[PDB]
Design a protein that fits this description.
This is part of a larger assembly, with chains A (about 120 residues), B (about 90 residues), C (about 90 residues) and D (about 90 residues). Chain B has helices at about 5-35, 45-60, 70-85. Chain B is mostly helical and about 90 residues long. Chain D is built from no helices and five strands. The chains are: A mainly beta (about 120), B mainly alpha (about 90), C alpha+beta (about 90), D mainly beta (about 90). The chains hardly touch. Chain B binds three RNA strands through helix 1, helix 2 and helix 3. Chain D: GO terms for molecular function: rRNA binding; structural constituent of ribosome.
RNA sequence: GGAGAGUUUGAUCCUGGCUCAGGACGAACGCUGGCGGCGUGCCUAAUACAUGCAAGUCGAGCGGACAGAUGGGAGCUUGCUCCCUGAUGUUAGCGGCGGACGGGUGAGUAACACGUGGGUAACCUGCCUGUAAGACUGGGAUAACUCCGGGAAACCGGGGCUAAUACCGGAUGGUUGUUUGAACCGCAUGGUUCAAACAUAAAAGGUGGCUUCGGCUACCACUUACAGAUGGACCCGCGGCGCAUUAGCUAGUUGGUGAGGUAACGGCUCACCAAGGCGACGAUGCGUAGCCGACCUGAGAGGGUGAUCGGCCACACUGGGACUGAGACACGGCCCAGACUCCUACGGGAGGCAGCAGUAGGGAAUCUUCCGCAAUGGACGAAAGUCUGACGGAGCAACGCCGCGUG
RNA sequence: ACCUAACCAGAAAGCCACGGCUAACUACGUGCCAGCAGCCGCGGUAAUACGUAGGUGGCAAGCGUUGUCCGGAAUUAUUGG
RNA sequence: AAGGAACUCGGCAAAAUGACCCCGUAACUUCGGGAGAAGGGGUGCUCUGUUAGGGUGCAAGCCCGAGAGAGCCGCAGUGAA
């Protein structure tokens, strides 16, 4: 439920603070992207010492939404803050740590590095 | 990686427990004789002065008192207890 | 207490103590209470003269020697004669 | 058997508005370590007027007491010279 | 105990700067390079760290536990094991002390931080002297030890059992607090000394040796009271720095009263009251910086630096916090948070080289991952001893100083 | 460590400077080119200044360059403008 | 719901902010402002408590009441306009 122009706060030590969406990547196409969905983005605000700066267009990956993650087993994951982790052209992240809890559905994507770098994968 | 006196760490835990029991018992007894000095009670004033006195010297005479602070506490408590009973 | 013991001094080839009275646990080449004595190990051999007029006040005013301080101050006639100070006990 | 010589220099009366502490600082001389010529200067001080019987502008100098307040060190001695007013 | 010379001019003198001769380093670089002795060697990034050692000790405190001379009985092998007693030796845990000294580094801080000089009728002091009293009567615990358990580990939990120099009642004790009677003297606070009532401890320890086996005694201990000594704590005078292109600052601030607090006065912290206080004699603010004995230089006044040795302060990955203790807000102790690394069974754990070396970075720039408690100082001991990267030494570098040589 | 005996002169000397300040001089090459330099300043075919060679002078298991501090600096002056 | 100006010539429109008390408030200036700048915190009830203190009254009596300490309960304390 993260369509175009949705300011997602970042969840790593890559330098960034607020990420602005541009286009969800799937297809012609779509207008929503729930959890684990790669987005083309920019960065509106940043911690001042960072390799990814303000005004730089680097892709990202959702981790958490206030929208639900719907596991196929009845239970629903839904966080209270939106998220991003920033990717450099392959699914190894540019970040170093990944803050906060993390939706476990990323592991069923190809993000097996991103799961290992993140504390509470639930 | 503590080389020696890790058992000093465990002795600081157990000694901190027993010392907290005696010292906190002294503070609670001092509030007890102070509470008995709160109201105008004669016989509880003198016997409770004996209670906070005996527990006071028994606390300051071993460990964390030590001497001058105990004389300050028993002195002011003696002033209030001597006030409420003459 | 103040353990009146030795203290190194001299070159790196030969050390010669000059055993001033010192604190309980001061540094080795550091602060001392009130220096009285000097006694090199060598030269020739072991010639050192001590105070005994204030050093009796130091050894009687609450103190003790080291090993070499006890053998030296027992050799110069100060520990025994101080014991004759305590012989009027 | 007296050994302690806690003594204070006699100075004028600067102000007594601070209640129970009428403090004023007296002036001594100094030599300038490069040039040589004499240059004096004041040195302020609070003075704990216990009776509060000081006069502002009356030269009375008192000796230095213990730490009595936040930077009030000298006790009073006597009103040595009264103020001449009117 | 002090030396000047060059350089403005077509020539001259003044005035005026600019440079050189001299010394010095914690130097580096260029060339070269025999030795010895004595000192010196991360000054830049308090940057991060692989690996080893840097604080242990007490069997003469404790209850074990194991081995075991020597002795005992069995089976066989004519030499062995099996089960007991036991000199003896060893140590995991409890407890006492020591990790607050020692070692390192200048990150901080422009004031009580340092130096100096007073003061403390405002403090405290374990260990050690010396004095003199005491060490009486009891209690219930608990780690060890096992039986189950949960954990990947780190590790926790629960049930049974024990002891001490562990802890905890009572008597006794003033001196340790509260009330009174005084006596003497001060620095406002008040201090010193005498008496009379209410409270406050003790390892009966251990070691030996002796004995009548009741007990005796010495030594090393335990407590209490005193003074001594060693240490730190506090307050204050004075001194040591660039800036006015920093003149405002301050509201727990200035002062009172009251209460609480600490070893202790104190807005130290709070309640209530008042409106104070600091400043051209430089407040505040920016900057920089550990300070001193001292070192280098100067004829001297002065100018510069705070290496190595010492004295004090500070800090211990960053930032708080408190416990144990006499004493820390603790460098190789804990709790929390942040950073960075390592482990992971993803539930959670582990770390602090500004100790000695040592590696990477930084840079022009700085070394051996060595020997030993023989000395001196420590620590623990009854001592024997153990630990001691302090120290005593060594290894490298012409890095400095001095001596000798290459005839 | 130091002592004693033997052995062999055998293995053990370089760095900077040579106009002035400042001890220390001539030749070849170069010809405002390459260069030096602390300041003064040299070098445009006779260079006591650039390199090279002999010699000299300083110093010595060391010698120069640079960094910083003091003096010279009476160029912060109280001494002393 | 989730996202918030991507709708649109244009935040049109709606949503939002708002009452007192207190803290605090910049550039700029014509020196008055700006400035309700900005940005924040408190409020409901019970008791202490015929509070402190005022107005009024001879007392009785009412009114007008800051400020605080304890405590209550709610998602919510100018609970609404």
């Amino acid at each position: 439920m993260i369509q175009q122009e949705t300011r997602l706060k970042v969840a790593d030590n890559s330098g960034a603070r607020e990420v602005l969406t541009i286009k969800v990547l799937g297809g012609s196409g779509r207008k929503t992207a729930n959890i684990g969905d790669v987005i083309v983005c920019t960065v509106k605000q940043a911690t001042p010492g960072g390799v990814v700066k303000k005004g730089e267009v680097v892709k990202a990956v959702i981790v958490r939404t206030k929208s639900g993650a719907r596991r196929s087993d009845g239970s629903y994951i839904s966080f209270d803050e939106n998220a991003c982790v920033i990717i450099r052209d392959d699914k190894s992240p540019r970040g170093t740590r990944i803050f906060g809890p993390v939706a476990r559905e990323l592991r069923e994507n190809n993000f097996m590095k991103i799961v290992s770098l993140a504390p509470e994968v639930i | 990686n503590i080389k020696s006196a890790i058992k000093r760490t465990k002795t600081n835990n157990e000694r901190r427990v027993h010392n907290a029991t005696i010292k906190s018992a002294m503070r609670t007894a001092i509030k007890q004789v102070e509470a008995s000095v709160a109201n105008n009670e004669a016989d509880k004033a003198k016997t409770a002065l004996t209670e906070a006195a005996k527990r006071i010297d028994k606390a300051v005479k071993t460990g964390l008192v030590h001497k001058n602070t105990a004389a300050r506490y028993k002195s002011r408590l003696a002033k209030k207890v001597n006030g409420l009973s003459a | 207490a103040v353990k009146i013991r030795l203290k190194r001094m001299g070159a790196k080839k030969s050390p010669f103590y000059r055993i001033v009275v010192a604190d309980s646990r001061s540094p080795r080449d550091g602060r001392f209470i009130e220096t009285v004595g000097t006694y090199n190990p060598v030269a020739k051999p072991a010639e050192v003269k001590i105070d005994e007029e204030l050093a009796l006040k130091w050894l009687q005013t609450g103190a003790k020697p080291s090993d070499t301080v006890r053998n030296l101050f027992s050799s110069q006639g100060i520990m025994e004669k101080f014991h004759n100070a305590k012989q009027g006990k | 058997s007296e050994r302690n010589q806690r003594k204070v220099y006699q100075g004028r009366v600067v102000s007594d508005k601070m209640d129970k502490t009428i403090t004023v600082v007296v002036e001594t001389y100094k030599k300038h370590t490069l040039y040589g010529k004499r240059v004096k200067y004041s040195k302020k001080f609070k003075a704990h007027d216990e009776n509060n019987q000081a006069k502002i502008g009356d030269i009375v100098k008192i000796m230095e007491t213990r730490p009595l307040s936040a930077t009030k060190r000298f006790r009073l001695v006597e009103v040595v010279e009264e103020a001449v007013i009117i």
